[PDB]
Design an enzyme around this catalytic site. Structure first.
Site, mmCIF file in Angstrom:
data_model
loop_
_atom_site.group_PDB
_atom_site.id
_atom_site.type_symbol
_atom_site.label_atom_id
_atom_site.label_comp_id
_atom_site.label_asym_id
_atom_site.label_seq_id
_atom_site.Cartn_x
_atom_site.Cartn_y
_atom_site.Cartn_z
ATOM 1 N N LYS C 99 0.846 -1.294 -0.194
ATOM 2 C CA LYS C 99 0.005 0.036 -0.028
ATOM 3 C C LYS C 99 0.955 1.224 0.179
ATOM 4 O O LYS C 99 0.538 2.270 -0.891
ATOM 5 C CB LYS C 99 -0.735 0.077 1.136
ATOM 6 C CG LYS C 99 -1.797 -1.142 1.439
ATOM 7 C CD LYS C 99 -2.641 -0.855 2.594
ATOM 8 C CE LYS C 99 -3.430 -2.038 3.104
ATOM 9 N NZ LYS C 99 -3.915 -1.615 4.584
ATOM 10 N N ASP C 224 -1.234 3.772 10.233
ATOM 11 C CA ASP C 224 -1.981 2.706 9.700
ATOM 12 C C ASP C 224 -2.736 1.793 10.968
ATOM 13 O O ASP C 224 -3.090 0.808 10.925
ATOM 14 C CB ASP C 224 -1.157 1.670 9.050
ATOM 15 C CG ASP C 224 -2.183 0.747 7.997
ATOM 16 O OD1 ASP C 224 -2.757 1.384 7.426
ATOM 17 O OD2 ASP C 224 -1.800 -0.534 8.054
ATOM 18 N N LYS C 264 -4.601 5.931 7.686
ATOM 19 C CA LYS C 264 -5.720 5.085 7.432
ATOM 20 C C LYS C 264 -6.866 5.728 8.270
ATOM 21 O O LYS C 264 -6.810 6.024 9.315
ATOM 22 C CB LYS C 264 -5.331 3.702 7.861
ATOM 23 C CG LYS C 264 -6.608 2.672 7.465
ATOM 24 C CD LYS C 264 -6.074 1.334 7.776
ATOM 25 C CE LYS C 264 -5.732 1.049 9.003
ATOM 26 N NZ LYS C 264 -4.764 -0.164 8.931
#
Lengths: 329, 171, 695
Positions: C99, C224, C264
């Site tokens: 990612k 994240d 995120k």
């Protein structure tokens, strides 16, 4: 054994581990040689002894100068289709090396198999890799290996060279783009070896069809000086009830279960433990010339022995010379 | 204490190892066999100073090897109960103190270390130090210790020292 | 739901950004009433303020269809239905690294090669500057592995994550040098819990990060954060709200001005989550909401991506810090913080609101199609994505990621790895002993300006790093074995240094405590970057940054790595001012000569290395007319005030040409030393010679 050629890295040459491509490249070599067993199909020469050298008188022979090099069969199948095979069966793709068809320069060669060596060379003080073509097995599926060594020798000239030269004359091939130089080893009739003598020895090639495998009639001669064997060096204290547990350098060869020989272990010899040690022979002793970083295992046992069969019953630099000159009369 | 004594040891020479020079083989055999050893009665056998006397060689009946009784001046060491000895600290632990006297490991437990010398792992070397931060016993220091008792294990001695009495700790 | 009317899967991703925030950054007086405390709402169905009701109900219904399904049956259908699933982690520790590889391509390398507002790179690999980054809530640091692998050692990472099964697996960084990363778990440093939601962990980490970045902060933060919401998947936004806030607060706490942030998030329906995105839109030059193709199409996972942190964000940071304290006070109560920006302020920015709605509704529409596609691939097991292998190959090509398997490094022995790292350089170069400085060799230090000097505290050794605690030393003789270093320290793989080992005494006498430390004298290779041909000071500039890169200040149990203090030879006088006579533990009370470093630590010096930094035929003069040093070529007779490239002394010339002035007994270098040996060079002899040859 991903080292392609030791002493240089070369552009575009790359080991081939792709499962579909490798099985093909190898398969097609066995095919082209009409080869039986597992492994390398390439014709394997043998060392000249006092018994062999009698064959130089039984039929016609050609001779050339061995240089230490690496043995590579080159398989030219297509356009970027060129590959190289090891004594090991290791396969390498070569990239910008191109072989024009002699009739039609726009076309490329396919179903061609070459035999030769990779050698490093010197002009400018820097390494220039070269592939020397010393035999040809197949051309266009044409079985030129069953033809005569002069036929095959000529074929290599007009089929694999003149064409690569013409296309270089024109600038379709800038010699510069190709990973290595490509050349044919010149061979001489038997009678000319007297004028000739990194060139380490001689090669005596029969006139007959190409044969894969062990060839008892192809003779490699080395001056008895350069005779060498690679042992794995194991030194152990040796005085279980013996008064002095002096550590003793033992030498090991592939295929043999127990120690082949002993070397007297020098203060310097020790750090080479577990690593391949290269030895010469002099005094009814073994000696350490260098270290090799290119193998984790020794020579085949029967190789070591055929080294010995060579050193004790040698063909001398002078013995060979008289034999040739007499027959030159 | 580092000692210069005379010791007697018997060497066994098989006839394969006679050679043209026989006595140099016995000297090399003695320098191999007893150097670096440790015995319970004679301590750390450091080195052999001078091989004084070579006995008469008694051929053992039925055996092949000859046997040489050998006297030799030797440098040795023995640890002693109550001897104050200089030492190099190798490790400071919350349980004790790993120091060295020559080749000897010496273990000084904290329970026989006084209440001033507390243990600290929070210093970047874990060390022994007081709340005044005056006496700092850490790794690779020159200290002094009083050897209480020794334990010989597997043909080598280790010892236990202490710091309870006066003038013990850092030099 | 017709999922077959989806666009053909592609490696080409589009980015839509918010407009540029034209409002000022909210101050403490404007934000003074923005924090609305209400009843704790655990309902998501009525959160329609920023998404059409029909789409919100449709995506919630399409999620809840899976609540009755076996998780392994769902996972197998999803693996066939996702066109991007064959990308996985490639050679990295997990799919999160991919990612970051995907987004760092899509965002013009802004993370791995950040730029000023004039488009110039903020970090140049040849200059003494490191790419500082942070990675929060990020265990096991897959995102970090890609960044460290991409930038090699030219980067330094700082980590904070919860202690436990999901801690940093630094051992598993097979593709990157884990020694360039430093986990810090908040209050107590290495011994902390790593709770991002807890303020004290944020504060201790905040002070630590600013200190380890020249008080500027990181170039970028990655975040994240997420936890298991098994059987409450529809409430994931509401449950994670405090973790979202604490990651945004962390960005405003440690990202530098002009720096970047990536976090995120999940769904963004609640006015709480949208108000947090509005505050980031105020605080940064540009913001966007982006779902990378390496995110699974049927999940609510997306990234907020912020570029260019503005000046004056302090009030918004300190506001969000107060809101986090309030959330912590309201834990396990029937009350919660329901707004962080008023709805009238958010909806007053029509340009922000029109992007926010369109981002949510577009995501819902794609997620509904992807959920219906997974349901169809559960009902019919013959359905497959035929292009997964093609799309994978194109994504890896596009993002510049090699198609290779994850292989544990290979274990090389230190001798074979040394031969690899020296690239055919003659081994005898490493065996050269220094020339002793004596009255017969003193003339060799001419011209004085060509030289640097440093104080030695042990014999010089080579040191090789094979990764983590696989550190070996060698004394330069071909007969000598590589010895494993018995120190608690860590170094990246592919590292080759010239070092000494120095014990740093703290205090004096009985209280004295000495700790051994690695002292770098010069550098050859730093985490696979060769530096041997760079100028000695330039090589040292790269070396100095490296010591910080491998530093671990949360780990006071580790043995320190340092670079030696390098002096100009015409300034050797500054060395003797740092020489003191100190009482060392075990010296029987006799004071010993001690060199005191930049900290409150000293070592016993053995002498002084003199290293040539200018190559022949060049030499450095001083121009009395221009008051500047110049380079003079003794062969051509040319003179220049700029550094000639061929005047640079590479490592092998610096090492071969080195002198050593030993400081044994009979040598006077401090005024308390008596007696002097007349055959040995004093400080006064060497300083007099230097003064005569400066002019």
């Amino acid at each position: 054994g991903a080292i392609f050629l030791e002493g240089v890295t070369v552009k575009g040459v790359t080991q081939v581990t792709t499962q579909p491509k490798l099985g093909e490249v190898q398969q097609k070599c066995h095919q082209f040689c009409g080869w039986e067993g597992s492994g390398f199909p390439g014709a394997q020469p043998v060392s000249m002894d006092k018994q062999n050298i009698k064959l130089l008188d039984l039929k016609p022979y050609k001779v050339s100068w061995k240089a230490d090099g690496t043995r590579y069969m080159m398989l030219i199948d297509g356009t970027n289709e060129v590959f190289m095979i090891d004594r090991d069966n290791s396969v390498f793709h070569v990239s910008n090396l191109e072989f024009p068809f002699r009739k039609d320069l726009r076309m490329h060669l396919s179903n061609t198999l070459l035999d030769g060596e990779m050698i490093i060379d010197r002009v400018n003080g820097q390494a220039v890799p070269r592939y020397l073509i010393y035999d040809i097995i197949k051309f266009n599926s044409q079985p030129v290996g069953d033809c005569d060594f002069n036929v095959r020798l000529q074929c290599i000239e007009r089929e694999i060279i003149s064409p690569r030269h013409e296309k270089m004359k024109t600038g379709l091939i800038d010699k510069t783009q190709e990973p290595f130089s490509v050349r044919n080893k010149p061979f001489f009739d038997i009678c000319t070896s007297r004028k000739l003598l990194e060139m380490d020895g001689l090669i005596f090639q029969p006139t007959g069809k190409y044969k894969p495998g062990r060839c008892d009639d192809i003779l490699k001669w080395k001056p008895p000086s350069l005779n060498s064997v690679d042992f794995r060096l194991k030194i152990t204290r040796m005085g279980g009830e013996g008064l002095l547990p002096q550590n003793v350098g033992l030498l090991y060869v592939g295929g043999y279960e127990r120690p082949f020989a002993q070397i007297k272990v020098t203060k310097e010899l020790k750090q080479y433990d577990n690593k391949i040690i290269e030895c010469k022979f002099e005094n009814n002793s073994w000696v350490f010339m260098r270290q090799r970083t290119d193998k984790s295992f020794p020579n085949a046992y029967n190789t070591a022995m055929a080294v010995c069969n060579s050193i004790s019953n040698p063909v001398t630099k002078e013995m060979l010379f008289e034999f040739i000159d007499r027959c030159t009369a | 204490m580092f000692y210069h004594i005379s010791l007697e040891h018997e060497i066994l020479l098989h006839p394969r190892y006679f050679g043209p020079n026989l006595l140099n083989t016995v000297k090399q055999k003695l320098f191999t066999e007893v150097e670096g050893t440790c015995t319970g009665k004679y301590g750390f056998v450091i080195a052999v100073t001078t091989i004084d006397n070579i006995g008469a060689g008694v051929i053992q009946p039925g055996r092949g090897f000859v046997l040489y009784p050998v006297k030799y001046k030797a440098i040795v060491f023995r640890p002693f109960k109550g001897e104050v000895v200089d030492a190099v600290v190798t490790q400071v632990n919350k349980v004790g103190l790993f120091t060295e006297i020559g080749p000897m490991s010496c273990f000084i437990s904290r329970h026989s270390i006084p209440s001033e010398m507390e243990f600290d792992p929070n210093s970047n070397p874990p060390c022994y130090k007081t709340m005044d931060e005056d006496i700092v016993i850490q790794q690779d220091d020159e200290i002094r210790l009083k050897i209480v008792g020794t334990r010989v294990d597997k043909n080598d001695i280790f010892a236990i020292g202490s710091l309870m009495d006066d003038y013990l700790g850092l030099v | 739901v017709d999922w077959r009317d989806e666009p053909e899967p592609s490696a080409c991703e589009q980015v839509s950004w918010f407009p540029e925030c034209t409002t000022e950054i909210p101050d403490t007086q404007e934000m003074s009433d923005w924090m609305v405390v209400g009843k704790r709402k655990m309902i998501i169905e009525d959160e329609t303020e920023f998404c059409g009701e029909e789409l919100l109900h449709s995506v919630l219904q399409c999620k809840s269809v899976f609540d009755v399904l076996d998780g392994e049956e769902m996972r197998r259908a999803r693996t066939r239905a996702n066109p991007y699933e064959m990308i996985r982690g490639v050679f990295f520790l997990n799919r999160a690294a991919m990612k970051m590889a995907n987004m760092d391509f899509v965002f013009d390398r802004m993370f791995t090669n950040p730029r000023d507002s004039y488009g110039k790179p903020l970090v140049k690999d040849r200059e003494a500057e490191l790419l500082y980054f942070a990675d929060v809530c990020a265990g096991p640091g897959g995102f970090s592995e890609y960044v460290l692998w991409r930038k090699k050692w030219h980067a330094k990472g700082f980590g904070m994550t919860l202690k436990g099964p999901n801690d940093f697996k630094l051992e598993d960084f097979y593709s990157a040098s884990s020694e360039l990363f430093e986990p810090y778990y908040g209050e107590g440093g290495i011994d902390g819990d790593g709770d991002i939601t807890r303020p004290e962990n944020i504060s201790a980490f905040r002070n630590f990060v600013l200190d380890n970045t020249d008080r500027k902060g990181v170039h970028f933060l990655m975040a994240d954060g997420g936890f298991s919401v098994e059987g409450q998947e529809n409430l994931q936004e509401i449950l994670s709200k405090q973790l979202l806030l604490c990651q945004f607060l962390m960005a405003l706490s440690i990202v530098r001005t002009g720096g970047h942030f990536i976090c995120k998030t999940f769904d963004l329906f609640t006015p709480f989550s949208v108000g947090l995105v509005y505050l980031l839109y105020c605080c940064f030059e540009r913001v966007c909401l982006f779902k990378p193709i390496t995110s699974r199409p049927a999940n609510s996972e997306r990234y907020v991506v912020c570029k260019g942190l503005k000046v004056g964000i302090d009030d918004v940071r300190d506001y969000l810090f107060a809101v986090n304290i309030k959330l912590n006070q309201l834990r396990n109560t029937d009350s919660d913080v329901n707004l962080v920006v008023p709805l009238e302020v958010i909806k007053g920015d029509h340009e922000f609101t029109d992007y926010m709605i369109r981002s949510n509704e577009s995501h819902c529409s794609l997620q509904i199609k992807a959920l219906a596609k997974i349901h169809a691939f559960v009902q019919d097991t013959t359905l497959s994505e035929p292009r997964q292998a093609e799309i994978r190959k194109e994504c890896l090509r596009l993002w510049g990621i090699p198609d290779q398997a994850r292989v544990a490094p290979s274990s090389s022995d230190p001798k074979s790895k040394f031969f690899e790292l020296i690239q055919g350089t003659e081994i005898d170069i490493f065996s050269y002993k220094p020339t002793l400085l004596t009255s017969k060799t003193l003339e060799k230090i001419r011209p004085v300006f060509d030289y640097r000097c440093m104080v030695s505290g042990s014999e010089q050794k080579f040191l090789i790093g094979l990764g983590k605690s696989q550190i070996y030393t060698w004394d330069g003789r071909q007969s000598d074995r590589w010895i494993k270093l018995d120190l608690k320290t860590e170094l990246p793989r592919d590292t080759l240094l010239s070092v000494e080992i120095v014990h740093e005494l703290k205090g004096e006498g009985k209280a004295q405590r000495k700790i051994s430390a690695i002292h770098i004298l010069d550098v050859l290779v730093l985490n696979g970057t060769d530096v041997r041909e760079q100028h000695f000071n330039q090589r040292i500039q790269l070396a100095e940054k490296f010591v910080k890169a491998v530093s671990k200040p949360s780990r006071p149990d580790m043995n320190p790595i340092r670079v030696k203090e390098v002096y100009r030879l015409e300034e050797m006088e500054k060395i003797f001012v740092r020489l003191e006579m100190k009482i060392i533990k075990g010296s029987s009370g006799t004071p010993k000569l001690s060199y005191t470093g930049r900290d409150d630590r000293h070592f016993v010096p053995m002498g002084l290395y003199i290293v040539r930094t200018v190559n022949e035929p060049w030499t450095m003069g001083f121009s009395k007319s221009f008051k500047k040093k110049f380079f003079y070529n003794k062969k051509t007779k040319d003179s220049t005030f700029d550094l000639p490239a061929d005047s640079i002394a590479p490592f092998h010339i610096c090492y071969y040409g080195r002198l050593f002035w030993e400081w044994g007994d009979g040598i006077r270098v401090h005024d308390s030393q008596k007696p002097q040996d007349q055959d040995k060079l004093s400080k006064e002899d060497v300083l007099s010679f230097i003064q005569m040859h400066r002019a």
